[PDB]
Amino acid sequence: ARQIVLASRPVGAPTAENFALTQSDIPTPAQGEMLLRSVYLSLDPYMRGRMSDAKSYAEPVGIDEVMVGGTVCQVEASNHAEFEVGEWVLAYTGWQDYAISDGEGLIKLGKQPSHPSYALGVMGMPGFTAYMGLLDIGQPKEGDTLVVAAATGAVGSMVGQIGKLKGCRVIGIAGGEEKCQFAKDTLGFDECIDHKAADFAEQLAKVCHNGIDIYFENVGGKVFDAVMPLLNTGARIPLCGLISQYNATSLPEGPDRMSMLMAQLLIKRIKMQGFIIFDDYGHRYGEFAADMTQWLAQGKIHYREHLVQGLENAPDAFIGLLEGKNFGKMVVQTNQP
Numbered sequence: 001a002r003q004i005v006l007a008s009r010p011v012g013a014p015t016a017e018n019f020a021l022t023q024s025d026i027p028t029p030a031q032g033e034m035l036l037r038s039v040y041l042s043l044d045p046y047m048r049g050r051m052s053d054a055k056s057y058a059e060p061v062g063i064d065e066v067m068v069g070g071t072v073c074q075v076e077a078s079n080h081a082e083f084e085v086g087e088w089v090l091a092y093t094g095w096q097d098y099a100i101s102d103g104e105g106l107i108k109l110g111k112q113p114s115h116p117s118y119a120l121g122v123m124g125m126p127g128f129t130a131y132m133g134l135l136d137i138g139q140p141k142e143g144d145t146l147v148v149a150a151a152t153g154a155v156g157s158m159v160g161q162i163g164k165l166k167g168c169r170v171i172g173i174a175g176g177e178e179k180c181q182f183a184k185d186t187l188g189f190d191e192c193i194d195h196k197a198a199d200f201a202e203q204l205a206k207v208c209h210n211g212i213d214i215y216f217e218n219v220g221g222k223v224f225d226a227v228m229p230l231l232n233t234g235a236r237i238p239l240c241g242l243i244s245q246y247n248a249t250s251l252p253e254g255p256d257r258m259s260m261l262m263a264q265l266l267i268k269r270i271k272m273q274g275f276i277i278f279d280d281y282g283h284r285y286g287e288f289a290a291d292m293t294q295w296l297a298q299g300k301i302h303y304r305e306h307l308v309q310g311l312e313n314a315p316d317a318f319i320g321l322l323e324g325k326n327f328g329k330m331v332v333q334t335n336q337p
């Protein structure tokens, strides 16, 4: 197997120097285990945090160890378990060609699943994140105003479309005119505001004439600063991500606003709740899968995928992913099936 290992921990934004490409002898499938060969590899913003050694919900990637991530693989070794040579499976083998496994995969067998790569997006972790965060924490009611940034991304597009079918007025936030116009034309968003526009806060306040009832937080920073004075009484904030600060080297200057945010949550009676989808939500995944399969069949969910070819290109893609260079859920094709 070839491999993308972490050469050095990045300073600010990650560079191509922080990664390295290396071959390794990948055999020993053994008895009781299996050898998986990857076809697709997901790239996700959380991986940035895994490059830094700051105290976090998970262990950082060790120097010269494989970079982590969910993959869609095929079995190529006779598993002694209940999986055959050919069964497609959603695994977590990282940025490499081969790995050895023995639970807990998810059979998409195979070897003829319809859209196996969808297991990394709309039917996988990002769609599940959007589903759970919006429905269980945001708890949308008819007439609620829903605002989400990174609106054409893996999680944001799903948040917006689910909110639309749940009776929300959905205000998107994205970077650049093309993404906002795609969010309106194809994803069904009522509005979509360019956060790169100089008068972004004023545009947001203008289209949010009735306030914000749910803010699905994906970005933080300037976007949340513009959102705060528009929050309604009883608003809900599913705290999903804060990508605007993933490359931050220090805290912003100026006076400490922590007590200010706490006073706002108190005065406006707001629920702000962080969540990590990788926690045990096994009791909800079946409901999510049934609902999302139905909504996809009904034509209420458009899933945009950004497929880039070549595992050797996986670093650069990831870097671009952090700057909004992606259009949709970023996936790298590592091998032909």
Ligand SMILES: NC(=O)C1=CN([C@@H]2O[C@H](COP(=O)(O)OP(=O)(O)OC[C@H]3O[C@@H](n4cnc5c(N)ncnc54)[C@H](OP(=O)(O)O)[C@@H]3O)[C@@H](O)[C@H]2O)C=CC1
Pocket: 044, 045, 046, 125, 126, 129, 149, 150, 151, 152, 153, 154, 155, 156, 173, 174, 175, 176, 179, 195, 218, 219, 223, 239, 240, 241, 242, 243, 244, 245, 275, 276, 277, 278, 321, 322, 323, 324, 325, 326, 328, 329, 330
């Ligand atoms: N809590 C959980 O368990 C999970 C959390 N997440 C979080 O959800 C968020 C998005 O996930 P995903 O949809 O996969 O990523 P995307 O597929 O949305 O791509 C990331 C997007 O972030 C946006 N972005 C990056 N920097 C900035 C910035 N400084 N200001 C505004 N927007 C920015 C860009 O969209 P644009 O071009 O519009 O700026 C970029 O395309 C991330 O924060 C991620 O960490 C993801 C999965 C699960």
